Amino acid sequence: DEYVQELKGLIRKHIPERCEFGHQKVTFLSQVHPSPLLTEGFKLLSSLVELESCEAHACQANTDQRFVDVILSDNGILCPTLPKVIPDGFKLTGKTLILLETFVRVNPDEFEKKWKADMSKLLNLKHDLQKSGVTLVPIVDGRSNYNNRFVADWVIERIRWLLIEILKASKSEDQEYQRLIHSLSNVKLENLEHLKRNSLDYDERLNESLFIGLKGDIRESTVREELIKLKLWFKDEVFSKGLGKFKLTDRRELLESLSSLGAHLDSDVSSCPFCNNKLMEIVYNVTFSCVERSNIEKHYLSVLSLCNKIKGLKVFNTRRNTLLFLDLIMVNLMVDISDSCQDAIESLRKSGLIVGQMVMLVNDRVLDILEAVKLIRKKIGTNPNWVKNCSKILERSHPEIWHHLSTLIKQPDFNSLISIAQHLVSDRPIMRYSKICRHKLFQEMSSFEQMRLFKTLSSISLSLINSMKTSFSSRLLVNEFGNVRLRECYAQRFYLAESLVGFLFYQKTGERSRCYSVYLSDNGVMSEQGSFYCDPKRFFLPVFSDEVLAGMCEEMTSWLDFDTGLMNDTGPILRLLVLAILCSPSKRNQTFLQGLRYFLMAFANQIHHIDLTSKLVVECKSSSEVVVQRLAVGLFIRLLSGESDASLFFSRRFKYLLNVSYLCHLITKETPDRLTDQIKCFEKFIEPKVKFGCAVVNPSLNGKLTVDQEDIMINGLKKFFSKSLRDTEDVQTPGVCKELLNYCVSLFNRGKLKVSGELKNNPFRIPKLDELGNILSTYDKEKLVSACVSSMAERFKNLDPDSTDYLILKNLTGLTQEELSLMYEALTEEQVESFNEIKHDVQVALAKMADSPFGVMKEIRAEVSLHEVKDFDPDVLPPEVYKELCDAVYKSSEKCNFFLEGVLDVCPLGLLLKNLTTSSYVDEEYFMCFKYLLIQGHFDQFTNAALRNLCFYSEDSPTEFTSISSNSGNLKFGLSYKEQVGSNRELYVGDLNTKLMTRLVEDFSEAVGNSMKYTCLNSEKEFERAICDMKMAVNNGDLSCSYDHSKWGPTMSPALFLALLQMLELRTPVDRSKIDLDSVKSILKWHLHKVVEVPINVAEAYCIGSTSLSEEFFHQTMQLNGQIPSHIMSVLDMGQGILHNTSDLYGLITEQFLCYALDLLYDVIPVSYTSSDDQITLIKTPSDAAEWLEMICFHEFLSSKLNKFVSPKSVIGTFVAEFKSRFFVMGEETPLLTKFVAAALHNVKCKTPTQLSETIDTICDQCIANGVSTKIVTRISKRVNQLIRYSGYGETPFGAIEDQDVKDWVDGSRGYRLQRKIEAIFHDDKETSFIRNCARKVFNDIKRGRIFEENLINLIGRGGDEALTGFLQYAGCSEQEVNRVLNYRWVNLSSFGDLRLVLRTKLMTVPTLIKTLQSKLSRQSSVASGFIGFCKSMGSKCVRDGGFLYIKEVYSGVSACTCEICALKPKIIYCNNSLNKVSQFSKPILWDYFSLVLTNACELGEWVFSTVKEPQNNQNFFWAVKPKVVRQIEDQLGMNHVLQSIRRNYPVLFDEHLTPFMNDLQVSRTMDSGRLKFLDVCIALDMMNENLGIISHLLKTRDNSVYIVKQSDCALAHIRQ
Ligand SMILES: [Mn+2]
Ligand SMILES: [Zn+2]
């Protein structure tokens, strides 16, 4: 015995920490025998691991291995007959359990699967336990390795190695040996030959149902003869009988059909867009009311801001009293202002911020004066001490920094207040809930009122976006049919002119859709403008884009300048259409505009589908879509009412109408409703499966099928492969005929198609699935609650303040009332609700840890007795089954033992329930207190094969597999949706194991396709070839067929791919071995038997509960057969985006076969390009295009015989060819302006102003690449700059991209336009010229002569002033030049680091060049809410120094001192002595200009040193240009070169935070092309400055390489050389 004897001596270095350790060690050491040794060794290992894991959580180790019922019986708990469960550790305290089960899994797959299966089994116990007993916190402590705190982490690996050596040495079955071995390794792809592949007496039926007719060896002449006969039959039995699928256009017929479907004539709506739409009407009213027509105000705004700041601290632990106190302060200061200066209450208020009988208050609230004084009247007489102590409480244990010297303590003089109140009479708002047209005929206004309409729309949209900003946890003082007289309504203001302002009143807070009321105020007289209903988070696009849209509309109008008289009739209607789309955002408008695009495509060409017009019509609702549909259809009929092809100008009309049709990108894509979208997604997923008739209900999820399930699966598979070549009744049904597949495969095998199997490079080299997209899943919620409760329990070594909430905010958002407020204000409304639920759960758990009903007047008998027995616990008890009034009156129960007198904020344990109940009773929240009363009322009331799978045994590991499973699951999936503009797309999310298998098959298919040629899906070279071929074919005038295939996802089946792969051979490159595709076929079978989990929300909505087949199916399977369906397994799914490359390969093979057939039959030359969903076929025909209809119909028929049905959107013609949304016309390419403009105006994802500027720069570069304009990009630049400025960051010299740019986005990077912006700041370019000359001198000195080295780097990191003065003295200067250059300064807020700010992110969580390099080494949220989070987070203590402070505090330290050099660019550039008070936030702009110039010279040549010289065309002649850059930095610039110089210069930064996960340092250390020419200094500059980003541009591609521009802009460019 070599290792057996050593085993006893090796464990001698063990600490007998516990009694059980020694108790088992004495048994171990005194017992040596091969049969019992291994079992007790495993037991000891697992025991020590679990003991350490639990003792990390203050466990009470379960040594007797007893159930939970027995341990509840040991203490005093009634037995509710719970399921029998053995927990690893239990801890009873008070009336709560802490149950934890631990395990160890080396690989992530088993770790995740075990974690899910253990969390579910613990969670299934709490429903039964809480019904008649205690509530438990479940902990699951999983470890990925065996390390612990009891051993030195050196003995465990050695003992495991020797133990597995013993196991593999001596034995005593088949798979248990392999499972023991597999569970002890460390780390461990295809070639799974270790598997067993045991049959099940079922897969044979699969064999003769899938492979009964596949041979793949047919000869060629027989195929030719059969195809000839088939064509002869089709000519005279299907085509001449009118059963085709494609038809000629007949322009007049299409125009009549469009006019009949779009322009409603059966509708009662009038032809005035303003009258039908509410928002449109309000915009019109405000515009035409405005167009045709003092230090106290600053003091009031400042004190209002101070009041908001003091209210943000919530230092009163109550909501009513705080609001009353702030109201008292505001009214006291109002009477203090109005006591003197009698011309104030009517001058700077009626023209400022006040309305009829209402004053603005804290928290953006507007309150009536009479109600305010009435509420202040209360709390007096009963609490005379209410004021004084409050005045005394703001000085002690308070910030004690308040300017309320007299406005605070002052008792409000009610006589003067009531005098002010009676000075003006009631004109309260009305808030209209739930007719002669006088609208001045929009077509007949001047060119000035329209821009005013756009400006008004922008202002109102900004007001809505700001209405989103109100704090969610705010309640009104007094709460509230068709008309309601407002008294405590929220309001927002928007300015229009000197006197009149606009108010926007609303009553609710959050992101939901509301009803707003718009009022005006001219000179104190408050009028009514209107009331409407909208969702605020859908109005972000027009927030400032009042000039971008005007610019694009003017350009599109100018596009029609070939007829003076057509643009005059199409301009105003186009503007009205754009404005109507902006004011009426909905998905139906998007769908209609997409239908318009497809109609245009069909109209331009010559052949189109017979079932096209049925895909254009979208039903109209609310009469707000009828107006936009009428406008769009009228535009289309007014434009394309002429002939086709042969015309003086037709390409311009097509361009204009295509751009009009992409107006649907203006409307956002953000799911108007989430539950509705989930329901629609589930419907779209499940309708075809049940229509086909093969959808089974809940399987076993273990690889076991009953006789009925396998029978229905086999029947479905037979029906799939039961189509004949002759029948025409099945053209739209899924299924593939075996004969044509045999023909295609046999013809592919004998190298006859354009592709063949001569492949090289041989290919074989914890989210819960039933809710996806939910902000916080059940698993995360329970984990968080358990963690918080465990931390609380271990801290109590009771009493508990509210600071516990702070703890929760550590785990939701990643990072002391300031910290709590900053963390709280970063949560969205739904996240706030989830946080409140977690709060309640934790508080209830602790209250339980700490340890009357005959109040019947209208309930208890039927209300709460059935409400508690209703859905789960009262934590989800709806407030609608019980009325509000009865809730309030039932709460009138007196104070008793259930209550306690006093708020008692400190709250010692044992009174949590009573304390929260009393506190919530004091405030307005009554239903929460009712729930608390409910919960306090207790109204919720030696074999080695089976006895070894309990401790750490990885029983669920893959060892043997069958045809339907792998003994490790059934390849579970999930359902979700991905937003698009037209309609949402399916999305399948998979577990880890199924993700690995899909990745394996995906890699194999990707390799096989990469061998082939004609696919263009993940190979840009083939896409470029397709683009060039399309361009030349359209130029020549050949036939182009754009084929978009319908239902590609939910139709194809893994069985089709199984048959195709069974019939293929895929010959090896140089071996000709006929690769065996066994593993691929096994994985494809596993896909064939996959499981898709239905969303839990859809099940709940259909259970609780308009006709739909999905709903009737769900009810039919509800209890008629079994239980609620939760899993759906079927034949034809091919999860969308799961088998993408395999589908591409199949489509390529079938398309090549079809092209061969067309060449064989009609003697044409087809060439096809496929992208796995859409394809383009370019057909060159010998020897006017109406005799090719038969060929097109035959092609469609043959495609339908395979599983490749053609959608009606497909078009065949000769005018325009489409592929991947890139339309080509004879001569040029269509620009698609509006798509790019709408993209630029959208996706404003802001985290820092610099990053926002960079993203907008990239988007604008891509925009100007496709010939948009140079007058539109400036307006987007202004919009981004104004969005930055409005956020409070203040304007900065760098900021967003430059204003007033030129065509020179080409041959210029981000640095060049930064340099241009700085040069534009200085007018006479004197100091800029001097710095440029110094830069040229330094550049020449480093290029030749006195060649320098890394010594210069030592100067860069010192600072800004020192670096500039050192470089000036190196070039050569004196004190005068240095002291003159260092005069210009700009304020750098991020001087001592970065802005401290938290954004609206998702829950559960150094120079930037390091982060970019780290990113290179490796491998749902809306826009308005994100921007509001940005603006709100940049108003708190953000900038750091020394400590944090505001931005306005820093900017208030500057002095005006406008002497000579602070007026060339106000609020941007200052002089030195003007920044004496704030000097640490002051850096020279000339240093950044110097760095920009040097870096630009390093990158794109030396021509950036010269001086700019200004030079001494129908706006429609486009032409293409190339970049004209010259580089001097070894342009190839491969990888592993920057890191070499960084290691040379910054070893400490290379060692730490850089390359931990790096395994090829040998190449990067052996001077791999080290010591570059300029890279020594051209990398240090970016390390210090945060807005150059030259490294990120070094290792990238231009991404455009071409720019289409105008003759108008190239002649206005600036010459610099
Ligand atoms: Mn297409
Ligand atoms: Zn009207």
Coordinates of C-alpha atoms in Angstrom, one line a residue, residues 1257-1465:
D1257 CA -19.2 62.7 -33.1
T1258 CA -19.2 59.1 -34.3
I1259 CA -22.8 59.2 -35.3
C1260 CA -22.4 62.5 -37.1
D1261 CA -19.4 61.1 -39.0
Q1262 CA -21.5 58.1 -40.1
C1263 CA -24.3 60.6 -41.0
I1264 CA -22.1 62.8 -43.2
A1265 CA -20.5 59.7 -44.8
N1266 CA -23.9 59.0 -46.5
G1267 CA -24.2 62.5 -48.0
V1268 CA -26.7 64.0 -45.6
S1269 CA -25.6 67.7 -45.4
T1270 CA -23.3 70.0 -43.6
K1271 CA -26.0 72.5 -42.5
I1272 CA -27.9 69.7 -40.6
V1273 CA -24.9 68.4 -38.6
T1274 CA -24.3 71.9 -37.1
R1275 CA -27.9 71.9 -35.8
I1276 CA -27.4 68.4 -34.2
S1277 CA -24.2 69.8 -32.7
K1278 CA -26.1 72.8 -31.3
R1279 CA -28.7 70.4 -29.9
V1280 CA -26.1 68.3 -28.1
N1281 CA -24.4 71.3 -26.7
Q1282 CA -27.7 72.7 -25.5
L1283 CA -28.6 69.4 -23.9
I1284 CA -25.3 69.5 -22.1
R1285 CA -25.8 73.1 -21.0
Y1286 CA -29.3 72.6 -19.7
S1287 CA -28.2 69.8 -17.5
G1288 CA -26.2 72.3 -15.4
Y1289 CA -22.7 71.2 -16.4
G1290 CA -22.2 74.6 -18.0
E1291 CA -20.5 75.2 -21.4
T1292 CA -16.9 74.1 -21.8
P1293 CA -14.5 75.0 -24.6
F1294 CA -14.2 71.4 -25.8
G1295 CA -17.8 70.2 -25.3
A1296 CA -19.7 68.6 -28.1
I1297 CA -18.6 68.6 -31.8
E1298 CA -17.8 71.9 -33.4
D1299 CA -20.4 74.4 -34.7
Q1300 CA -20.0 75.8 -38.2
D1301 CA -18.1 72.8 -39.6
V1302 CA -17.2 72.1 -43.2
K1303 CA -16.8 69.1 -45.7
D1304 CA -13.6 68.3 -43.9
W1305 CA -15.0 65.6 -41.7
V1306 CA -13.0 63.6 -44.3
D1307 CA -9.2 63.3 -43.7
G1308 CA -9.7 64.5 -40.1
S1309 CA -10.2 62.8 -36.8
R1310 CA -11.9 63.9 -33.6
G1311 CA -8.7 65.7 -32.6
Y1312 CA -8.6 67.8 -35.7
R1313 CA -12.1 69.1 -35.2
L1314 CA -11.2 69.8 -31.5
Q1315 CA -8.3 71.9 -32.8
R1316 CA -10.6 73.6 -35.3
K1317 CA -13.0 74.5 -32.5
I1318 CA -10.2 76.0 -30.3
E1319 CA -8.8 77.9 -33.3
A1320 CA -12.3 79.2 -33.9
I1321 CA -12.5 80.5 -30.3
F1322 CA -9.5 82.8 -31.0
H1323 CA -10.3 85.3 -33.7
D1324 CA -7.0 86.8 -34.8
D1325 CA -5.3 83.4 -34.3
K1326 CA -2.2 85.0 -32.8
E1327 CA -1.5 82.8 -29.8
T1328 CA -2.7 79.8 -31.8
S1329 CA -0.2 80.6 -34.5
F1330 CA 2.6 81.0 -31.9
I1331 CA 1.8 77.7 -30.3
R1332 CA 1.6 76.1 -33.8
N1333 CA 5.1 77.4 -34.7
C1334 CA 6.4 76.1 -31.4
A1335 CA 4.8 72.7 -32.1
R1336 CA 6.4 72.6 -35.6
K1337 CA 9.8 73.4 -34.0
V1338 CA 9.4 70.6 -31.5
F1339 CA 8.1 68.2 -34.2
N1340 CA 11.2 68.9 -36.4
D1341 CA 13.5 68.6 -33.3
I1342 CA 12.1 65.1 -32.5
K1343 CA 12.0 64.1 -36.2
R1344 CA 15.7 64.9 -36.8
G1345 CA 18.6 66.9 -35.4
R1346 CA 18.4 66.6 -31.6
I1347 CA 16.4 63.4 -31.4
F1348 CA 15.0 63.1 -27.9
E1349 CA 13.9 60.0 -25.8
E1350 CA 11.6 59.0 -22.9
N1351 CA 13.1 61.9 -20.8
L1352 CA 10.3 64.1 -22.2
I1353 CA 7.8 61.8 -20.6
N1354 CA 9.1 62.8 -17.2
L1355 CA 7.8 66.3 -17.9
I1356 CA 4.4 65.4 -19.1
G1357 CA 3.1 63.9 -15.9
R1358 CA 4.1 66.8 -13.7
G1359 CA 1.2 69.0 -14.7
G1360 CA -0.2 71.4 -17.3
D1361 CA 1.6 74.7 -16.6
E1362 CA 5.0 73.1 -16.1
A1363 CA 4.7 71.0 -19.3
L1364 CA 3.9 73.9 -21.4
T1365 CA 6.6 76.1 -20.0
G1366 CA 9.1 73.3 -20.4
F1367 CA 8.2 72.7 -24.0
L1368 CA 8.4 76.4 -24.7
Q1369 CA 11.9 76.6 -23.2
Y1370 CA 12.9 73.5 -25.1
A1371 CA 11.8 75.2 -28.4
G1372 CA 13.2 78.5 -27.1
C1373 CA 11.3 81.4 -25.4
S1374 CA 11.6 83.8 -22.5
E1375 CA 9.5 84.8 -19.5
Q1376 CA 7.3 87.2 -21.5
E1377 CA 6.0 84.6 -24.0
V1378 CA 5.4 82.0 -21.3
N1379 CA 3.6 84.4 -19.0
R1380 CA 1.5 85.6 -22.0
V1381 CA 0.6 82.1 -23.1
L1382 CA -0.3 80.9 -19.6
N1383 CA -2.9 83.8 -19.3
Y1384 CA -5.9 82.0 -20.9
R1385 CA -7.6 79.6 -18.6
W1386 CA -10.8 77.5 -18.6
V1387 CA -12.6 75.8 -15.7
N1388 CA -12.0 72.1 -15.5
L1389 CA -14.7 70.6 -13.2
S1390 CA -13.1 67.1 -13.4
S1391 CA -9.7 68.3 -12.2
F1392 CA -9.1 66.1 -9.1
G1393 CA -10.6 63.0 -10.6
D1394 CA -14.0 62.4 -12.2
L1395 CA -17.6 63.5 -11.6
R1396 CA -19.3 61.6 -8.8
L1397 CA -22.7 60.6 -10.2
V1398 CA -25.0 57.6 -10.3
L1399 CA -27.3 57.0 -13.2
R1400 CA -30.5 55.1 -14.0
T1401 CA -28.8 51.7 -14.6
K1402 CA -30.0 48.1 -14.0
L1403 CA -30.1 46.4 -10.7
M1404 CA -27.6 44.0 -9.2
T1405 CA -24.7 45.9 -10.7
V1406 CA -6.7 55.2 -14.0
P1407 CA -6.6 56.5 -17.6
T1408 CA -9.4 55.3 -20.0
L1409 CA -6.7 53.8 -22.3
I1410 CA -6.2 51.0 -19.8
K1411 CA -9.9 50.2 -19.9
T1412 CA -9.9 50.2 -23.7
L1413 CA -6.9 47.9 -23.8
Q1414 CA -8.5 45.6 -21.3
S1415 CA -11.7 45.5 -23.5
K1416 CA -9.6 44.7 -26.5
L1417 CA -7.7 41.9 -24.7
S1418 CA -11.0 40.1 -23.8
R1419 CA -12.7 38.5 -26.8
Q1420 CA -34.8 48.0 -22.4
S1421 CA -34.2 51.3 -20.5
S1422 CA -35.6 54.4 -22.3
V1423 CA -33.7 57.5 -23.2
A1424 CA -35.8 60.2 -21.4
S1425 CA -35.6 58.5 -18.0
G1426 CA -31.8 58.2 -18.5
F1427 CA -31.5 61.8 -19.4
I1428 CA -33.6 62.8 -16.4
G1429 CA -31.4 60.7 -14.1
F1430 CA -28.3 62.4 -15.7
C1431 CA -29.8 65.9 -15.0
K1432 CA -30.8 65.1 -11.5
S1433 CA -27.5 63.5 -10.6
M1434 CA -25.6 66.5 -11.9
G1435 CA -27.4 68.8 -9.4
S1436 CA -26.1 67.2 -6.2
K1437 CA -22.7 67.2 -4.6
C1438 CA -20.7 65.9 -7.6
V1439 CA -17.3 67.6 -8.1
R1440 CA -14.6 66.5 -5.7
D1441 CA -11.7 68.3 -4.1
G1442 CA -9.2 67.8 -1.3
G1443 CA -15.0 66.2 -0.1
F1444 CA -17.7 67.1 -2.6
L1445 CA -19.5 70.3 -3.5
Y1446 CA -22.0 71.6 -6.0
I1447 CA -21.2 72.9 -9.5
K1448 CA -23.0 76.3 -8.9
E1449 CA -20.9 76.7 -5.7
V1450 CA -17.7 76.4 -7.8
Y1451 CA -19.0 78.6 -10.6
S1452 CA -20.0 81.3 -8.1
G1453 CA -16.4 81.8 -7.1
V1454 CA -15.4 83.5 -10.3
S1455 CA -15.3 87.3 -10.6
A1456 CA -16.6 89.2 -13.6
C1457 CA -13.6 91.6 -14.0
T1458 CA -14.2 92.0 -17.7
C1459 CA -11.1 94.0 -18.5
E1460 CA -9.8 93.0 -22.0
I1461 CA -9.6 89.2 -22.5
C1462 CA -12.7 87.8 -20.9
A1463 CA -15.2 89.0 -23.6
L1464 CA -13.9 87.2 -26.7
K1465 CA -15.7 84.1 -25.5

